[PDB]
Symmetry: D2
């Protein structure tokens, strides 16, 4: 089979690999719709998580079950499923500890396009079908469904980690796909004011649609100053770091109230360190908590988000600004995330 | 001054009381809009809180500050305010413990028409204005605003206590005003499926408006059997108890999943005890946590709920089915809560 | 092989059964030390979990692995291991929800002597050896180690659910083995005053040993009255229910502060319902949270408790008043739990 | 009256000041025993929190009330009291938010020797006596009690913020007085393995006494390698940062497991930023939570810590390596904190 792979740092291309076969608990799946992630740009062009050789890319897919192992009980060939970007080995210590994202080591629940051939191939392999796949309700369009495995789970996790109080104020820094789902998640956790930070007009409109009550641009002056101005010097209860550089951490510390929470869902891809401003962190005593977490995955996570879409709590289709037909256009969609045109949020490639 | 009072258990009527004066930290407030609460029906007629003599009733008001003590800093004569039903003494050990609702004793945070002349007078007294009042944006209509002091803080507290997971299923038993804000709160906490329980058509329509995806009627079979058939024997993740008898707890225990949470905000004003079904509570080992709390009050709570209304996260006006004008209709509005018309959710009396 | 079995309700005896064989992920273990649980007495003589036929009793063992399936990686024949009383199926929705104790159904994590042949046999079966077994350090005596599978995890879970604040006052109702571990767990969570409730002299001394500052005996007045007296009317921050009838629930509600928490770890094998006193539960608004959970099991839990024993944070050997040797003494140990004598806390039978 | 004070950055001396008078809620207290804090060293000589002129230093005292305001109810002249280091204004939004340490602003709950004359004078002023004083039981000697206002509440807060799981592993970096209480606190939260990092023999002995099961010295290699060695490369569940420079944060991140928590209580007094290592923090996605908080104060905190001392949960007397008599020796003790002789942990000056 063919797949679109990372050949080595800085290099991508189509390659040929043998079609994968399932273990007793696994599934072979055919992608029906897929999408490229900013994370893969980081890993390919920034070397953000080490070198790789001929690793098929991509980890956002809706698919058709093509075969299952003899122990798989809940899925069968022909079943349409949503595939989480995160597909943990479930029988590990980290799972017993409550962190499947890290089953087998740091970030190891994220297999596709990390330590496993991704979804940009004619077939891909899913470990532990029964624990890691969710059935796709026919009422959910492919384009929207494909926003669930990564964009929705990541953005909503930003809002979960934030431990938002009802009616409290939230700043979401960065309004790309993850940030927009951060705003939406924040809204679904009962935030009052939601201040989005960004400027691409299509992101700004998306942001308002998902619940931002205010939009700040980096031109009306420093973001921190603007937030202080909007809040009369009082700052905000929560900050979700969804994009930008690592100087965003400092901005977040400077913007939040003492006792607030800063939630990072941003995949930082470069730099040796992230910096915490000493003084505004109360010299370590301001109770400004800093969290940062890989999105949840697995079947339960998908079914929960599926329910959120099915019952129309959120509509992730607005994230999808580009849709292409055809296997080969995986590459086109991939290059789209690299040069990132100004009208782009998320591309989806339809394969059926 | 005049005030509408409980003369004694089973008796209400207008009385003449001396106009209250403020200590250095207090404000005197004149109401602009008020509403009656079901809980005052309990105390007046079921002696639910013991005997009382000439206690002015009511604890749901938006008002205007008339005078403030020499130590009051943030409010002055003229300001329009939302008054929480719960107005605690803030210098107590329960406050250091984090439970203002019980400052000075169980439920002691609730003073108005509990241990203090309530808001159905030409004027009323607010202890600690700076800590207990919040400015009312002019953008918010009185009939919506008056839903904040009690109905909203109560319904929402049901959803908070419930510790809702994003996408999880919630049953709300009882769809009166509080129950309806429970449904809204659940949605605002990110609930997927929300199953409301109750019959009154007008409540039913408000329940759908606030987020209910299902409405269960007692008399289509016992509620637990209905919930099971809806959820294919799986049960629900959370139950909020907002109305009905004490048998409601057993129903909750039976329908909620192990590891689930049952959140009560209902006033149970009759019977010696509530019953937990031993077997369905796993004989004590089912991790079915049971919680029950008085609504938060104070300035912060009000300010937070106000932001939710102000940024249109919730529209409380659909709670109001009856609007009266003039100080005299307070009586009519109160008795309306006693006989409970079919078309009634919540009555409001507009004064100026 | 032979095992000591529940022949049917009210009847116990030795039976012959075939030696179990392991699946790919399982282990066959031989007991090196075992102990009887009060829970089994309820099962056999009160039919508290339904009738059973020839079900081997017991679920507290330290053992020697004698056989492992082909997929077992961390355990091999000859390994000395601590076996948790709870051995869940790990690949289930309840696990993904964070509740292994309920994997596959309410309490389904508890297999041994519930839905599965228990440890009172020449051999027994442990499902999922890698997830469910823990290595026993040679430095821990068998009799101490066999308190870990159940007594310590249950008792400590009582303190965990109690969510104890440092320096706060805790009452533990019932000072049998579980309550004594409740006392120890509470001290290890940083409780200040710990008030144990019981009368048996041997349990009384042990309670003191594990950290009780006060021991209350019903012969000195109503427990609630006594707690109110000890706390000069203020009550206590937390109550752990570890023994007594279901009337302990009412006592616990009446003695805890508003905002407090009541943690049940007691197995109520009798009655139709537990009763919550209405008034003292603030008619549902006192923020008096009621929790109740089956103990955690599996490998992580065992390994954490082992560390606590290993580093001398707790000494569970004081739970052990009777040490027998040999399989026959299993029956003697069991019956000892039945007609519980006055010098008895926990009996242990050492097999090699 | 006489006071020992910071004249300006890098300068200390005795000065004469007006004896303060109480407001209606305040008390005037004379010190019976005081201790100096490393924090005052940072503020004076590193100008860590900015310029100051004639600010009486010190915020750790046990004292006798010599006058109260007309509104003070629970304290009278002659009463012996433990005075918390943190004495917040209780009627503020931050208190409503649950963060009294920052009442009126970041760190503002900390008044003595921050933005108010401290306890190193013949008298000092305590705002809101009834909320901020605790009675000293006669059973507690002055030297132990004076460890409560700061050392104990700070070290214990480190363990509380760390959210320790029972039997889990903890590294405490820095074993001066605060770190030693961090060790004790962690043991009182049910920690299993506890690894202390530090070198001074007297601290090493105290660390063992308080619960450290291992002790690491910077001399024997990089701390992170040492910890990876003690833990078979698995790292630890929690890290408490209680001393050292800011490079400690990077150490803590490298040391802790994914899903772990890092709790800072160290008062950093120099440098622009603190660095988080990008890679070891999973590029922002390792779920390695960073916390950092000023110690709780107020009456309740003191009362709970008094219980821990009274009921012999912790014996803070071992922190006191130097006791001097006489008011003038405040200077002696303070200079000890500057010079840090190898046998010093905490000095105490007895004034009665
Ligand atoms: Cl096509
Ligand atoms: Cl006051
Ligand atoms: Cl096998
Ligand atoms: Cl003993
Ligand atoms: Cl060990
Ligand atoms: Cl005051
Ligand atoms: Zn991605
Ligand atoms: Zn009410
Ligand atoms: Zn048992
Ligand atoms: Zn200090």
């Amino acid at each position: 089979m063919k797949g679109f792979a990372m050949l080595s740092i800085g290099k991508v291309g189509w390659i040929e690999k043998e079609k994968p076969a399932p273990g007793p608990f696994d599934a072979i799946v055919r992608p029906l719709a897929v999408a490229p992630c900013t994370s893969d740009i980081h890993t390919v062009f920034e070397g953000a998580i080490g070198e790789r050789h001929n690793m098929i890319l991509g980890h956002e897919a809706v698919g058709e079950v093509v075969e299952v192992g003899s122990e798989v009980k809940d899925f069968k060939p022909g079943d349409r499923v949503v595939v989480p970007a995160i597909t943990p080995d479930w029988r590990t210590s980290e799972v017993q500890r409550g962190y499947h994202q890290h089953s087998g080591g740091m970030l190891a629940g994220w297999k596709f396009s990390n330590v496993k051939d991704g979804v940009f191939g004619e077939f891909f392999h899913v470990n532990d079908a029964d624990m890691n796949l969710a059935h796709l309700p026919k009422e959910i369009p492919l384009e929207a469904a494909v926003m669930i495995p990564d964009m929705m789970t990541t953005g909503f996790h930003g809002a979960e980690l934030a431990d938002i109080e009802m009616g409290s104020s939230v700043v979401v820094i960065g309004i790309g796909a993850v940030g927009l789902m951060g705003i939406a998640g924040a809204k679904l956790r009962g935030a009052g004011r939601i201040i989005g930070v960004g400027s691409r007009p299509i992101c700004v409109e998306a942001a308002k649609f998902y619940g931002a009550t205010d939009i700040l641009n980096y031109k009306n002056g420093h973001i921190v100053d603007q937030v202080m101005k909007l809040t009369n010097g009082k700052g905000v209860d929560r900050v979700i770091m969804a994009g930008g550089g690592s100087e965003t951490l400092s901005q977040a510390v400077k913007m939040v109230k003492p006792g607030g929470i800063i939630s990072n869902i941003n995949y930082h891809g470069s730099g040796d360190a992230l910096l915490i401003p000493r003084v505004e962190w109360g010299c370590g005593m301001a109770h400004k908590t800093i969290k940062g977490g890989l999105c949840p995955g697995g079947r339960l996570r998908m079914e929960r988000l599926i329910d959120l879409v099915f019952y129309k709590r959120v509509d992730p289709s607005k994230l999808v600004t580009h849709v292409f037909r055809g296997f080969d256009n995986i590459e086109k969609a991939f290059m789209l995330m690299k040069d990132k045109p100004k009208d782009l949020i998320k591309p989806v490639v339809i394969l059926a």
